Amino acid sequence: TLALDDLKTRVESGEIDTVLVCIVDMQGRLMGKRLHARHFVDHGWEETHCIMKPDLATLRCVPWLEGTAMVLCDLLHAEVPHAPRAILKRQLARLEAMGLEAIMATELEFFLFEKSLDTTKEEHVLRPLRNHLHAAGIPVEGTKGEGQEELNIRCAKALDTADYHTIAKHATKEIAWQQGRAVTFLSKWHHAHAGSSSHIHQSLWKQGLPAFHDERDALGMSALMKHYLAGLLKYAPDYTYFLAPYLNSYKRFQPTRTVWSVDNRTAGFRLCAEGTRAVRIECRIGGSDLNPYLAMAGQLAAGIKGIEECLALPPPAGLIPQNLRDAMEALRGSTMLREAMGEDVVDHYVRAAEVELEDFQRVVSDYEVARGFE
Ligand SMILES: Nc1ncnc2c1ncn2[C@@H]1O[C@H](COP(=O)(O)OP(=O)(O)O)[C@@H](O)[C@H]1O
């Protein structure tokens, strides 16, 4: 990350002239304004409207853009509750009031199309992606080909991980564009091809130790981790919507069973690195269309309250909402998320799901037409 005073040298030098002052919307997108950096260092970092308060800890250079830097903001006379960033921070603050620090990672998938939007060949997008992100302070492990690719970023404090996921989403679209190539984070862009997921690894820490670990434990799972996983499991449909916010999200489901497992393909929750310090939980429910903040904040809610009831952990080996109408309702009736996040926030994202279904009633798809000549 980039010191404010450091920015101000880069501005007077004339190396940086743009600061993207962003928040993150429901869709998971960077939204905001593009300030002339002189204005930003003089009164723009203070506050601007749309109110956005820049968080100078989030200030980065943006190597895949000339003269350009960015900062993420808190949206405000207090913090607006249904802002995804704010929603994730709230859960995390619960966690720290218990001495617990969440540590998280995202296996972000996408599709590289050969045409513009209008090994060597892949790397013309992937290599800059890796290199520029790394040069933005984001801890890139690398790329793995699943034209379906995947970006590995080293785990981090959950709020870091969310920012990274977001920024890397952004960088990929931009770098692909500049490379004349399309990229989509669609969970299912076609029937014939694989779904793109966003697997989410999680673990809790306390003052430095892996709270999820009992060296004692049969496979390495401590008391608290079991309560945690049991919560994720109990409330998987409550927050299915934050994993699967669009119509198209449910077509990846052709990894949806409310079970945990260390070997299964059907379990919505894989157990990784059994036996070790790096013991953690993998949620495989989300596709790559998801909002990181919300998906993270949703599970932490379920994980926290799994602990606060000392809920018991069933053996490894019902179903999550199979569509968006069901998932929306499952959120509406989520008295868990209601208390965890607030009645107003839940109602807000319920309405968000409502608008998404209604948006469908107002366009006539190609599939209707084709199937409609009988
Ligand atoms: N304790 C942990 N908590 C959360 N995420 C972790 C932890 N340890 C590793 N990870 C993350 O899990 C992801 C999956 O990594 P893995 O499947 O072990 O292959 P590799 O680590 O060799 O890339 C990695 O991006 C890594 O950052």
Q: What is the 3-state secondary structure (H, E, C) of 123-140?
A: HHHHHHHHHHHHCCCCCE
DSSP state of 6: H
Supply 173's token pair: 């679209």
H or E element in which residue 239 lies = none
Strand spans (E) along the chain? 18-24, 30-36, 52-54, 60-61, 68-75, 101-112, 140-143, 148-153, 156-157, 183-184, 198-206, 209-210, 257-261, 267-272, 280-283
286 Cβ contact partners less than 8 Å away, ≥ 6 residues apart: 197, 198, 199, 200, 243, 244, 295
- What residue's CA is closest to ligand 1, atom 25? 154
Using CA atoms, how far apart are residues 112 and 86, in angstroms rounded to an integer? 32
Q: What are phi and psi of 367, to 5 degrees?
A: -70, -40
344 CA distance to ligand 1 middle (Å): 35
41 Cβ contact partners less than 8 Å away, ≥ 6 residues apart: 4, 7, 8, 11
Ligand 1 neighbours by CB, cut-off 6 Å = 103-105, 141, 152, 154-155, 201-203, 278, 280
Of 103, 144, 151, 155, the one to substitute when testing ligand 1's pocket (max ligand atoms within 8 A of C-beta) is: 155
269 CA distance to ligand 1 middle (Å): 15
Using CA atoms, how far apart are residues 291 and 82, in angstroms rounded to an integer? 13
Using CA atoms, how far apart are residues 341 and 299, in angstroms rounded to an integer? 12
Task: List Cβ<8 Å contacts ≥24 apart for 306-311.
Answer: 306/227, 306/228, 306/229, 306/230, 306/231, 306/232, 306/233, 306/234, 306/235, 307/224, 307/227, 307/228, 307/231, 309/227, 309/231, 310/227, 311/227, 311/230, 311/231, 311/234
Q: Are 282 and 272 in contact (CB under 8 A)?
A: yes
Strand, helix or coil at 71?
Answer: strand
- Among positive and negative, which fits the CA dihedral 127, 132, 135, 139? negative
Tokens 């500049």 — which residue?
178
CA distances from 291 to 29, 217, 260 (A): 8, 34, 23
Resolution in A: 2.6
Task: From 337, 1, 341, 340, select the one nearest 156 (Cα to Cα).
Answer: 1
Strand, helix or coil at 3?
Answer: coil
Using CB atoms within 10 A of its CB, is residue 290 exposed (0-12), middle (13-18) or buried (19+)?
A: buried
H or E element in which residue 2 lies = none
154 CA distance to ligand 1 middle (Å): 7
Strand, helix or coil at 152?
Answer: strand
Using CA atoms, how far apart are residues 131 and 263, in angstroms rounded to an integer? 34
Q: Are 132 and 173 in contact (CB under 8 A)?
A: no
